[PDB]
């Protein structure tokens, strides 16, 4: 058979098609799923990434501060912890089904406190105060396809691998018809729910609908970045019909961020260290004893700057880590140390680490361009000063460049550079319609994002706009000693 096209790289998973409604003859024929070694979960790739080191690492006194300010390593989230914990505990002890929607901006401690509530629930179930439950964590931004959540959750429930539609019918039949005495309670963390709802609202409506079933024994914790995601993905009738718990996560204040930072630094500040003077390795208590500190006002202004802009813990922790890294860079450069009295992280280190975030490189990039690129930007600024359109044709820029060269003939620099600009300093080269490196600087300003150019194959009538603002361009061209006097 002669084919019209070929698909030669099809890789298909060995996933079955038959849903759970056909695994048994009747609803009364289903055994105890808790007493089954494939149900409810009743990582071999670590040794791939393993090797042996030859030389010992020199662990500098600041590397403790850097390692201990990582996001991988619950002050201020007590009402949220209490609310999620009492909703989940009350629904678990009553063998009911509930759903808690948690919203907020990134980095405010949403996933962390939901996980801490879940571990506290697991510890209480270890003391047999509440019945046992399965914990499933489903992240919408960790998927190839949004329907794979259906494949994931059922695989955590039954242990078998199905396709997503059959998994959806299996989960529907599990939460609807399977009796409560033959099943276990399930707590689902639906993180990044906006990643799974972009195409359509099937996953949102299915997961919220399963908690309305009397047989479900299902706890769904759904975490998102906007508050009106259920109100705009489902109607108000549906959201009134489910009745989810609604919890917002406001950004941290500066005092809360400060307590977070020095609770990360509780055992390290104002502490002693035995430091090897020839290598720089430090051991927490030929050897010098060095005290280490971070000042209070540095953390204070860092947490004050973060709480004004974003209020998230990740930025505050990362500027503290960057300040410690800057201090350790200067320390290692001063003492000549390698990789294999009082040491302080100062206010100026936090200032510099914040200034790398605060400042922009647009003006600095534009002041170090060539004369032709600055000529292009100056001609563009002259054109938007004259006709006031904010989009200029490229031919108008060419004519404005030609006019600026022709007018300033008495200037020493323009007289010295015009032969370069229109003949590349050579008498065998004819006078060109464009300047030398015209398309080079046009492509460079388009690649940098300074410019925007429309898609048009006529090079004269094609339009170009500044993609930054007019004031950084004015500040850049007034820095140049050539452009600012003409």
């Amino acid at each position: 058979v002669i084919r019209k096209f070929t698909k030669k790289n099809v890789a298909r998973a060995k996933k079955k098609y038959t849903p759970f409604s056909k695994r048994f003859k009747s609803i009364a024929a289903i055994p105890d799923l808790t007493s089954l070694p494939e149900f409810y979960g009743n990582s071999r790739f670590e040794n791939k990434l393993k090797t042996t080191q030859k030389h010992q690492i020199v662990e500098t006194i600041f590397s403790k501060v850097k390692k201990q300010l990582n996001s991988s390593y619950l002050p201020a989230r007590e009402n949220e912890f209490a609310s999620i914990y009492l909703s989940a505990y009350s629904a678990i002890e009553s063998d009911s089904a509930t759903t808690i929607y948690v919203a907020g901006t990134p980095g405010v401690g949403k996933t962390l406190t939901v996980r801490e509530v879940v571990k506290e629930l697991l510890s209480s179930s270890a003391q047999r105060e509440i019945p046992d439950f399965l914990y499933v964590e489903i992240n919408g931004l960790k998927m190839v396809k949004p329907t794979d959540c259906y494949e994931t959750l059922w695989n955590k429930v039954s242990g078998e691998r199905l396709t997503w539609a059959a998994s959806m019918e299996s989960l529907e039949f599990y939460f609807k018809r399977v009796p409560k005495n033959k099943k276990k309670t399930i707590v689902v963390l639906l993180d990044e729910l906006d990643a799974m709802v972009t195409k359509s609202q099937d996953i949102m409506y299915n997961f919220f609908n399963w908690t309305t079933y009397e047989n479900a024994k299902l706890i769904v914790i759904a975490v998102a970045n906007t508050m009106d995601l259920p109100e705009r993905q489902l109607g108000n009738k549906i959201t009134s019909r489910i009745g989810f718990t609604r919890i917002m996560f406001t950004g941290y204040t500066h005092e809360e961020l400060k307590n977070i930072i020095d609770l990360r630094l509780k055992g390290l500040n104002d502490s002693f260290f035995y430091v090897d003077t020839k290598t720089g390795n430090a051991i927490l208590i030929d050897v010098r004893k060095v005290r280490l500190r971070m000042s209070a006002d540095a953390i204070e202004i860092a947490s004050r700057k973060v709480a004004s802009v974003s209020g998230d813990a990740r930025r505050a922790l990362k500027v503290c880590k960057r300040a410690a890294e800057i201090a350790e860079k200067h320390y290692m450069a001063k003492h000549g140390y390698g990789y294999d009295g009082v040491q302080t992280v100062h206010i100026t280190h936090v200032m510099k680490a914040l200034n790398e975030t605060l400042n922009s490189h647009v003006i600095t990039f534009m002041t170090r361009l060539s004369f032709t690129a600055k000529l292009f930007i100056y001609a563009l600024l002259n054109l938007m000063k004259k006709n006031g359109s904010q989009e200029q044709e490229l031919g108008d820029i060419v004519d404005e460049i030609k006019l600026l060269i022709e007018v300033n003939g008495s200037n020493k620099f323009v007289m010295e550079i015009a032969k370069t600009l229109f003949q590349q300093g050579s008498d065998n080269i004819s006078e060109q319609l464009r300047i030398i490196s015209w398309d080079f600087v046009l492509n460079q300003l388009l690649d940098a994002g300074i410019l925007f150019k429309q898609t048009m194959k006529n090079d004269r009538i094609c339009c170009v706009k500044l993609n930054i603002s007019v004031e950084e361009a004015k500040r850049a061209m007034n820095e140049d000693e050539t452009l600012r006097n003409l």
């Binding site: 002669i2 084919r3 019209k4 070929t6």
Partner: protein, 116 residues
């Protein structure tokens, strides 16, 4: 477009050659024709309703088929079903394409009105 013309032409060519291992439906089927099937190739293109095909596409397809002239086992014949007249056709084709088509062409009045 020219891509669909070439893909349909090479699918029909490969199907007709197989009728009496998959391949790419492009002009490398033409250059590899004697390596696969062992015999020489004579393609006869019949363009139906030439007054209806977009002439830029047809010009680019003729320029595409010009690339097969460097293969010694290929000859190409073109049949144009002209409905209006020949002067209306050559005013829509580019002059280099007309110079290409001028080397050997034959006109044939195929109307039922001719001679009654």
């Amino acid at each position: 477009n020219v891509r669909m013309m070439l893909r349909r032409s090479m699918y029909k060519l490969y199907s007709a050659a197989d009728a009496e291992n998959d391949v790419s439906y492009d002009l490398s089927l033409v250059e590899n024709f004697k390596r696969l099937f062992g015999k020489d190739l004579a393609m006869v293109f019949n363009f139906k309703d030439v007054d209806s095909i977009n002439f830029n596409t047809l010009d680019n397809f003729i320029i595409l088929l010009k690339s097969a002239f460097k293969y010694d086992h290929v000859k190409i014949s073109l049949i144009f079903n002209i409905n209006t007249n020949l002067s209306n056709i050559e005013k829509n084709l580019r002059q280099s394409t007309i110079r290409l088509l001028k080397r050997n062409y034959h006109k044939l009045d195929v109307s039922s009105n001719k001679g009654f």
